[PDB]
Design a protein around this ligand. Sequence first.
Ligand code: 4SV
Ligand code: 4SV
Ligand code: CO
Ligand code: CO
Ligand code: ZN
Ligand code: ZN
Lengths: 327, 327
Amino acid sequence: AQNPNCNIMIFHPTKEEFNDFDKYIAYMESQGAHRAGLAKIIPPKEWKARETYDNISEILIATPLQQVASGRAGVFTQYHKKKKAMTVGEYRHLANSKKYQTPPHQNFEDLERKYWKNRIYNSPIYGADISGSLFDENTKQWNLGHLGTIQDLLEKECGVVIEGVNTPYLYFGMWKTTFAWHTEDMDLYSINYLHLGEPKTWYVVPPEHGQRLERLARELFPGSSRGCGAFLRHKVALISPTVLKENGIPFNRITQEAGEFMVTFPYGYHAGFNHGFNCAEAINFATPRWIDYGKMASQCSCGEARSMDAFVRILQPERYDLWKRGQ
Amino acid sequence: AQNPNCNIMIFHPTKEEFNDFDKYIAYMESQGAHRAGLAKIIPPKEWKARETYDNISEILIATPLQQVASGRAGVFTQYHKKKKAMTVGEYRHLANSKKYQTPPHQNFEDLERKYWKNRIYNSPIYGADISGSLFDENTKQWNLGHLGTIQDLLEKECGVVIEGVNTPYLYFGMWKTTFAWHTEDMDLYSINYLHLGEPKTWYVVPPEHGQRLERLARELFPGSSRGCGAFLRHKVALISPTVLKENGIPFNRITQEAGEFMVTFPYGYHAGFNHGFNCAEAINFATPRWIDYGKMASQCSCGEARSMDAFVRILQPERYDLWKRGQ
Ligand SMILES: Nc1cnccc1C(=O)O
Ligand SMILES: Nc1cnccc1C(=O)O
Ligand SMILES: [Co+2]
Ligand SMILES: [Co+2]
Ligand SMILES: [Zn+2]
Ligand SMILES: [Zn+2]
């Protein structure tokens, strides 16, 4: 077995190796990368997503989300308060203001300490889930808007044509903006490129130990757990590395910097935070190995959790009716 | 001036000519094709959208629309009554049933006569605007899911990056299903491929005479006109070729058959109907020549009309606030 400790692996493809996305994902998994739940891919030195980021200030963040925390420093939930629209230019200026800017710190470890100590006492604003892409149409390699669709993958594997289209999303972040513990919809893969700005710190639980995190979550969020058998689908729960360690949950951490890709693998629980003003782009994808995870993915049917129809309809026909009632 | 009578032109590209989409659209316009408002493109004999259509019955039509008419035979409006979900297999069976099937007829002209005589007395069900594609991912030429985006076109022409993603839609039709008189959102181009089944008959007004149609529409639909300065954006008004002829409106007609593409050009008003069970796929696109049409496109701000944000925001900043109130 490759990567038996489930370490987060870092890959440095050559430009030749960067030319076939599916092939390289499969190569990564041949080295056991998937066992960590997360991998970093450093693009070839001659690769670029686009020429410059000088012309992005007029992008509109239609519904910025103020992330309001409740609980304790290491165990909290966050809810999203909708704010008025602003441009990326206005958002960037807000992120760099005295109220929201990254504080003085010695290094990543000091910043991480400050995040978990102080996160709940501030309510940063996140420009998340904006449909769009910052890849140049002429970028041929690892262009997240030119990947094959999950609908075509399901068709290729299962022989069924389905409706739906999957496209990338942009995430404009600032210091303390947070992504809660979750796996992807239908336990899909995700790929995330950090286009510009300050880093993004990730935490991840190996897929083989995901149920351990779920068990801890039910204990730490009893109200949420009673409300929904798959409440982590609501994407609101945060648990710090110290609390995970206290409870024996196996996990790893890594910091993503501008110009780097992160891939999350099926049923790899992850969470994290942004260091300062940045912009990432992400999309879900599938491989043949995903199908069996799709079939077993837990579903939120309480109505709180936000193409999905067809995947549940085909892979989980028994769940489909009740899941559809929740929607 | 090419094509001064504004005739609908039909093109037969070679496989070599079929290899550069933008180039061929530009070639078509060099021959005056755009003046008609609509063109037909017959693909090369060796081209195909996909291998077979044997595996499409499990596609879900989440919200089939029953098209209910009001008015007179040649001048009517239609509203869409939402029906319960059905699969394409179930829809196809309904379309072929005695209640909904194409009636006996001698030819296209007889069927057209029957449509305009009898359309208002039936309420056919249309599986319209389903996000998805039936093109094989391996189809390299004129794959409507692999076109360059309107957002990238605007960026390339105007130097502004914007949010948004544009993807194709599927249309499952039956006899008498109808598309009302309209131009595309922001007076964009559209491209439509008829994947399978019975034909689709199109009517079109040359872009240079669009305001003549608008004037007639205001006279024929006085209530709708008073309610909204751009009510044709609601996509509910039908006017027959006989009534257009009586009122001196220049127009043309053509019937699209399975395996053929239709392109609508900026500000080319069009309408039509399906002959029987079929499936079409369509998407909007842009070229450099569209920009000036985008800037002048009329907007519905009464709230009735259904990526758009950014195009109005950048090309029509003066209209943006009031348009946003309507939404
Ligand atoms: N929202 C997310 C979800 N999964 C991974 C990363 C993020 C992010 O916000 O960067
Ligand atoms: N809905 C439409 C809009 N424009 C052109 C064609 C159609 C169609 O229904 O085929
Ligand atoms: Co994620
Ligand atoms: Co149209
Ligand atoms: Zn739930
Ligand atoms: Zn209106």
